[PDB]
Design a protein around this ligand. Structure first.
Ligand SMILES: O=c1ccn([C@@H]2O[C@H](COP(=O)(O)OP(=O)(O)O)[C@@H](O)[C@H]2O)c(=O)[nH]1
Length: 277
């Protein structure tokens, strides 16, 4: 019954984090990741930071149907095999998720392989956190010495107050809405293009990020969907063992963005090229 579905879905093949990073670097590929929220949206549901939207839903479906080629790595949650890597609560969440969406997952994902959606989630739900340093060190090699364009939300503040991007040669940021960024999609795409000349683009923008990465990739740019990497890095730096709320910025899975004390970070402010919303 349900278990038969769990087993059928284990036919989906995901390159785990460290392995995914190698594909990206070899092809200098854009990366687009599909997580639980994207499945929610595609099957018709609103999620905490993005209301359901038909065109977004169609685009996401189209993007997931794109085979991982040389220009793009398409990622799925790395939960279809070796679930034992994750804590019990994560395992329960993910199995319930892919069974709720058995109709979707049984018909959506026939590509020979996928990257790991957890390249942005390399710490908090793991039982053995040892490879995390290797994970974060390997991630950092994507931007060491690069000029970056970071497209993210107002509360995202990726790298703010930590050393995640210390080795980037420069950072420019396009700061978009923290929720429902798709309401402003046309502008976000327009300014990302204008600001992306000779830069590696990193996108932390929920479901909108996926369409952005795809459209950018169509227009020739390399764009990497990095989602909640900052939350996971903050948790890691703290040596955290559970999802603790951050006080100064957005925190993964505290997605209402309530109770935040924003700070003035002059370095962050000097990186901002434009605000949208
Ligand atoms: O309309 C939105 C949707 C989300 N985000 C940001 O998108 C990031 C999370 O992206 P995603 O859902 O892809 O993360 P994942 O959990 O898959 O890593 C966070 O910084 C959110 O603040 C945003 O700024 N605007």
């Amino acid at each position: 019954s349900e278990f038969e579905l769990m087993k059928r879905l284990s036919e989906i093949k995901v390159l785990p984090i460290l392995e995914s990073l190698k594909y990206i670097k070899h092809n200098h590929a854009s990366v687009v990741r599909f997580g639980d929220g994207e499945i929610d949206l595609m099957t018709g549901h609103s999620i905490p930071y993005q209301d359901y939207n038909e065109k977004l839903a169609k685009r996401l479906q189209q993007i997931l149907q794109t085979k991982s080629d040389e220009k793009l790595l398409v990622c799925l949650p790395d939960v279809f095999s070796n679930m034992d890597r994750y804590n019990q609560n994560a395992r329960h969440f993910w199995e319930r998720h892919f069974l709720k969406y058995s109709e979707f997952y049984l018909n959506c994902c026939d590509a020979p392989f996928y990257g790991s959606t957890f390249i942005s989630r390399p710490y908090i739900d793991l039982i053995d956190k040892s490879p995390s340093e290797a994970y974060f060190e390997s991630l950092k090699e994507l931007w060491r010495g690069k000029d970056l364009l970071i497209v993210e939300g107002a509360t995202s503040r990726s790298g703010v107050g930590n050393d995640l991007f210390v080795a980037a040669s420069s950072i420019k940021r396009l700061v978009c809405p923290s929720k429902n960024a798709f309401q402003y999609y046309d502008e976000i795409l327009r300014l990302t293009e204008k600001n992306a000349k000779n830069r590696l683009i990193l996108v932390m923008l929920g479901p909108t990020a996926k369409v952005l990465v795809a459209d950018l990739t169509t227009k020739g740019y390399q764009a990497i969907d990095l989602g909640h990497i900052d939350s996971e890095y903050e948790w890691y730096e703290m040596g955290a063992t559970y999802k603790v709320k951050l006080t100064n910025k957005h925190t993964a899975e505290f997605n209402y963005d309530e109770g935040i004390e924003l700070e003035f970070s002059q370095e962050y402010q000097e990186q901002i090229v434009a605000r949208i919303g």
